[PDB]
């Protein structure tokens, strides 16, 4: 198989707004869409079982003024919800292990071997970085001191809407420059938040390299042109 | 196809027409016993007076000495939403007791157990009512009671813009013909379960009644057992034999 | 048609009275008729010459030709000689016949054909629908000498509201000639007129010195009153959606939250107009207290869509403004009106001037009552009877075509006050709706059952005491073209409910020209923009009304209040 994906630009397979397709033996399927702003998007052919040779591609979107559609930016005079809610994410190195905090079914394979100083292997202080979500400009404690339990090391609950102000205030503080990238989202020419090679002028530059200690906010306004269809489920 | 057939003059007692002192009705009720008449709360609140007459198959005409069931006062309901619709059930406090005649037949009381066996089997139902929920241009002089099927719960929250809870669900045909606001408000959607008759629906208007061919709104009195029990035993024994039986109660239905 | 019982009167009268002796007590019991008894003397009596034989004429026995004088027609012939059908008998529009529909309903007073209500002078004539002539005779054939009566007609054949105009013409509208500037009175009433910059000047032709986007005019003489405007045949291009590009410029939200002190506008001057500038949209009821009663209950259009309207009840206290017209003797309901302040009162023009009706009022028989919730009741502590004394006609009063701008304007001299039952209303301008094309806020057109007793009859509902509102929804344009057989000017739109099978309707309530008072959702204030004209949709079979786009005429009031100080 081939785990293909259309970064940024979202297709419409079977009249359904999707951005991924991974079947086998060349399934009889075609799609179509409508391009957006100019830029350099990515065709991420991320195939884990097929990477010893190389398979990468991108999208080169220029600008030829021919026709203009009736695409309105904001919602049509009813929905806005302009709020000052920016998702705070700090790439911390809190002590997180494979076994849960005080395991229930007793994961002795990792508790008494790698979780602490038992068996004299790794230790207790780890550097496992996890993407969380804070409630203020502190970068040290979220809604609670530990985690939300229901997600663990996985990302918590994040919902998007019109003018959701997806301003990911990312501030790395570990030992390797990290960033963030939502699956299939169109951003601004100023902020990156996507593995893009589009390095143009200072006006349309985008760099996601966030060194440990430096903070960067990926500001972009998610509006009505970032929502799926009507027949599918609510939140994709 | 079974269309809008009128009610029979035999087994169709549940029709307590709630009118006014003048020649102007508003909604209807449900006959179950001699101390409580289930109907919508907007029948009396934000309306006019209250005049009930059981066994009245026609409003303009009269079939003799049969329509007599006057009401003294009335109260409201706790969960009754004034703006929308939710648990829209009100009890009419009659003033004169009426025996069991031909056009006045009693019915057994519902229970919480008939909630998982009545909705999965009887996927249909009948809506008894003179026709006062949609009093626009279909005011029939004859007591009409059409048949409406039951639909899945996942297709009732989108029938109207108002989010519907569990108390009310679908009780009509698909988006084809006119199957909503049938009969009088507070109309009994009694479903013949098995050897008995238990009402399980009250037709009410949500945002009024216009081009509502999608689905209908009908309550479920199986969950309303805690309200019909708190307003029957806490009131005590009938003092003057149904005065008020008993209207002297708090507004949130005790 | 089913059983031998109803088809017995056709073959009964054969050789007993057609060519024999009969009168009243000789051949009366051989007819068998219980309901159609009195009308039998008029149906059989039609052949003025002779009724013999039977298998030849068949005019005064069934209904085919019009031998004799022509009084009825059984066939379905709606054509006349101009394409427009005859006027319906169950309504009086635009003229008023001698009889209505209350003298004899047994003679089928429906289906507008070719009949004769009074004497016969030529044949089955009709009433002219257009205000041009008065009668339009038909061309119904006649037995015997098949000849054509009258000769039939084959009837076979600057953009941006006009700014940079350079035409060379000088044609008035009615009959008010205007001279030039080299006469004597060149600069008369011109002390506060706001001059713009667009068209140049000229000697004696149609020009636009003020700078109006409506039309051009000149300084006429005649009588010290108003002035006429020039007319030019442009094009029928509608001001619908713009075909350029495809984007807009409107807002996107305006967040829910009443944060508005006093951001109102002012166009007129308090000096030469009076009040009605600041006191607007401030009713001591449920406006300043930030509350909601049972008035504006209009949520989303996707309530549950719409089916058939009914018209609910009302309550005393929700309809403050109520300006109508009445007569001192007798006291009968006329048509609706409006009020912009406390002096100039405007109303419709199709209820005051009608040359064909031969009734022109002066400055005494034109009364006006403001603030009323019933008809039989009569108080004094809540309202006061007003009185008019000044009348003014409209320059472009071309009502003989398709009713083009029929709005009158009087003047009130009684210094009345403003309380709970009397509420004034301002007027919008242009600096607030420059791109609000995707809207359509309706007004509060109150009134009882008055329109049903002015043009038609409508037997069933008399004069109800319920403040019934009138809905005026917004519609496209081709909705009343594929099904409507009569043409309509692009200046006026359509208003009506699409019938499903063939039902009538109940949407012509209120008054004949109620006030269109709309609350502005920007600062919570009632505004007045537009006047409801003549309505239609309850006399045929559920059609569409006609309402002309009358949104301008704002600067015309300012240029005629100059005689208050002179």
From Swiss-Prot, chain A:
Origin organism is Homo sapiens (Human)
- Resulting phenotype, residue 69 to G: In Hong Kong; does not predispose to clinical thrombosis
Q: Where is this site: Cleavage?
A: 69-70
Task: List each copy of the Plastocyanin-like domain by range.
Answer: 83-236
* Residues that carry a glycan: 32, 117, 195, 203
Taxonomic lineage:
Eukaryota, Metazoa, Chordata, Craniata, Vertebrata
Name of protein: Coagulation factor V heavy chain
Curated annotation (Swiss-Prot), chain B:
Catalytic site positions: 42, 88, 185
Q: What is the effect of changing residue 21 to Q?
A: Reduces activity for cleavage of PAR-2/F2RL1. No significant effects on factor Va (F5) binding and activity toward prothrombin in the prothrombinase complex (F10-F5)
The outcome of changing residue 24 to Q is: Reduces activity for cleavage of PAR-2/F2RL1. No significant effects on factor Va (F5) binding and activity toward prothrombin in the prothrombinase complex (F10-F5)
Q: Spell out the residue ranges making up region: O-glycosylated at one site.
A: 242-251
Q: Kindly list any coiled-coil regions of this protein.
A: none
Impact after mutating residue 28 to D: In FA10D; uncertain significance
Q: What's the impact of mutating residue 214 to N?
A: In FA10D; San Giovanni Rotondo
Effect the entry attributes to changing residue 49 to E: Reduces activity for cleavage of PAR-2/F2RL1. No significant effects on factor Va (F5) binding and activity toward prothrombin in the prothrombinase complex (F10-F5)
Annotated effect of mutating residue 140 to P? In FA10D; Marseille; decreased cleavage by factor IXa; normal catalytic efficiency for prothrombin
Domain annotation Peptidase S1: ranges:
1-233
What does the UniProt record report as the effect of altering residue 148 to A in this chain? In FA10D; partial loss of activity
Disulfide links within the chain: 7-12, 27-43, 156-170, 181-209
Mutagenesis / variant outcome for changing residue 76 to A: No significant effects on activity for cleavage of PAR-2/F2RL1
Query: What's the name of the protein?
Result: Activated factor Xa heavy chain
Query: What's the source species for this entry?
Result: Homo sapiens
Q: What is the lineage of its organism?
A: Eukaryota, Metazoa, Chordata, Craniata, Vertebrata
Whole protein: which stretch is covered? Answer: 235 to 488 of 488
Swiss-Prot record, chain C:
Q: GO molecular function of the protein, one example?
A: lipopolysaccharide binding
Q: Which UniProt keywords apply?
A: Acute phase, Blood coagulation, Calcium, Cleavage on pair of basic residues, Disease variant, Disulfide bond, Gamma-carboxyglutamic acid, Glycoprotein, Hemostasis, Hydrolase, Kringle, Pharmaceutical, Protease, Repeat, Secreted, Serine protease, Signal, Thrombophilia, Zymogen
Q: Its GO CC terms?
A: blood microparticle; collagen-containing extracellular matrix; endoplasmic reticulum lumen; extracellular exosome; extracellular region; extracellular space; Golgi lumen; plasma membrane
Positions of the record's site feature: Cleavage: 155-156, 258-259, 307-308
Residue span(s) of domain Kringle: 65-143, 158-235
**Biological processes, Gene Ontology terms:** acute-phase response; antimicrobial humoral immune response mediated by antimicrobial peptide; blood coagulation; cell surface receptor signaling pathway; cytolysis by host of symbiont cells; fibrinolysis; ligand-gated ion channel signaling pathway; negative regulation of astrocyte differentiation
Q: Where is this protein found?
A: Secreted, Extracellular space
Query: Any other noteworthy remark?
Result: It is not known whether 1 or 2 smaller activation peptides, with additional cleavage after Arg-258, are released in natural blood clotting. Thrombin can itself cleave the N-terminal fragment (fragment 1) of the prothrombin, prior to its activation by factor Xa.
Q: What does this protein do?
A: Thrombin, which cleaves bonds after Arg and Lys, converts fibrinogen to fibrin and activates factors V, VII, VIII, XIII, and, in complex with thrombomodulin, protein C. Functions in blood homeostasis, inflammation and wound healing. Activates coagulation factor XI (F11); activation is promoted by the contact with negatively charged surfaces. Triggers the production of pro-inflammatory cytokines, such as MCP-1/CCL2 and IL8/CXCL8, in endothelial cells.
Name of the protein in its database record: Prothrombin
Q: Which organism is it from?
A: Homo sapiens
